[PDB]
């Protein structure tokens, strides 16, 4: 149809939306967005927004350092251009704030999301982003109240429940987390009686229960919960990681290494497993593989303070005291802007 009559912009916009959807293609979306922007004023703003979203999605699935920053800058430029071309749409401001929050620039993103809330304050995603951003500023009660109000408005969501569980575990105690988890299980049972989504939700519920149990020092209950959860998916990386963690807590430091290796053999991009493996290997005595693992981790991602702290600690025993000091400083300055959960959990869909 585009070939037949190159006059309208709705057709390429729909094509780009379909390309960006569950089919998970990126180049065609880029081509459609460029075609739209090549040709009133609303349509070009929508094309700029789509191009920025495509750039952000491409940046998320990168593999090295520089192009990540390049694509982030391109997405920020596209978002600010779209906002300039049209200042009367809350979606553009919300997406601009979400993109800006990735670069850890907190006050500017907070101002932009405040303006977006000013335009419209009934968006569940806006409230969730506000609570997540307040979490990074170390104000737990305010975020808890925000999540409570969001739950009151939408008493059947799922992501907000997970955020509430995590915040309660970090702030109030384990009993509230247990009550929330059992309420979530009751809600899931009531809502249902094909798609893999219910199974993954149940698995996540069981994993969160195992984690809240492992935080108090009762390995038997956590082991039982994770064994029950593993009946559905016996080859997931999460269950292997949890088994490695419970073995680590048990006191036997041989099977934990095997579990971590098995988990890493499935998902090479996992971060926590490799950090735990490096920490275990450090006290063993070997200082040759740990540095390589930490360098690979810092190459894959450069937004975690734990890996920087571990690298500094392991390098302290090597001799380069200045490098260890600067790594410690980097880890400390990075920890000041660490949210409770990653910002990427919020979906980015046109």
């Amino acid at each position, epitope marked *: 149809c585009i070939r037949l009559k190159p006059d309208d912009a709705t057709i390429p916009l729909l094509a780009a939306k379909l390309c960006m959807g569950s089919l998970h293609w990126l180049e065609e979306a880029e081509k459609f967005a460029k075609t739209v922007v090549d040709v009133t004023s609303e349509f070009k703003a929508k094309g700029y927004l789509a191009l920025g979203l495509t750039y952000s999605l491409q940046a998320t699935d990168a593999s090295l350092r520089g192009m990540q920053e390049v694509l982030q800058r391109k997405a920020l430029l596209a978002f600010q251009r779209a906002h300039s071309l049209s200042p009367t749409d809350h979606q553009a401001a919300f997406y601009l704030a979400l993109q800006l929050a990735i670069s850890r620039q907190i006050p500017e993103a907070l101002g932009y999301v405040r303006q977006a*809330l000013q335009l419209q*304050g*009934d968006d569940a995603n806006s409230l969730h982003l506000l609570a997540l951003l307040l979490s990074a500023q170390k104000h737990y009660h*305010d975020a808890l*109240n925000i999540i409570d*109000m969001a739950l009151s408005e939408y008493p059947e969501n799922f992501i907000l429940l997970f955020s509430k569980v995590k915040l309660q575990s970090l702030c109030r105690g384990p009993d509230e987390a247990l009550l929330t988890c059992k309420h979530m299980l009751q809600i899931w049972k009531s809502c249902y009686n094909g798609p893999l989504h219910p199974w993954m939700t149940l698995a996540q519920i069981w994993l969160h229960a195992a984690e809240v149990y492992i935080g108090i020092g009762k390995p038997a209950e956590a082991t039982a919960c994770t064994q029950e959860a593993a009946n559905l998916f016996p080859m997931s990386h999460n269950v292997l990681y949890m088994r490695g963690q419970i073995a680590e807590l048990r006191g036997s430091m041989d099977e934990a290494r095997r579990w971590y290796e098995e988990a890493l053999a499935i998902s090479p991009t996992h971060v926590k497993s490799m950090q735990r493996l490096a920490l275990i290997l450090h006290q063993l005595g070997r200082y040759s593989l740990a540095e390589k693992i930490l360098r690979d981790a810092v190459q894959v991602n450069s937004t975690a303070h734990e890996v920087w702290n571990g690298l500094g600690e392991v390098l302290q025993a090597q001799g380069n005291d200045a490098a260890a000091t600067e790594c410690f400083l980097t880890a400390l300055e990075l920890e000041a802007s660490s949210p409770a959960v990653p910002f990427t959990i919020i979906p980015r869909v046109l």
Partner: nanobody
Amino acid sequence: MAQVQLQESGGGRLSCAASGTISASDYMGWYRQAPGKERELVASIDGGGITNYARFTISRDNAKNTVYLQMNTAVYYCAVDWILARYNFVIHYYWGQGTQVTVS
């Protein structure tokens, strides 16, 4: 980096001063707490000039980011609050320690 601290004086022309920069959109309010009584919002003001009372005259200086109150027994509190109240919400972003005032 710069932490925002609030200094209140005049208890015994009340003054409340902050060493940092506060946007005019944020609300600044006076609260009262007396022994045996609950927290009560007494006065509020924005950067636009509209003031809400439940007697006193208030002035805001943006150049120095200060508030003065002229009057004619409790702890008074100066707070920096956000409204965001399509449905009557309120949050206390900054809460001070207050100062005791006794009236015979």
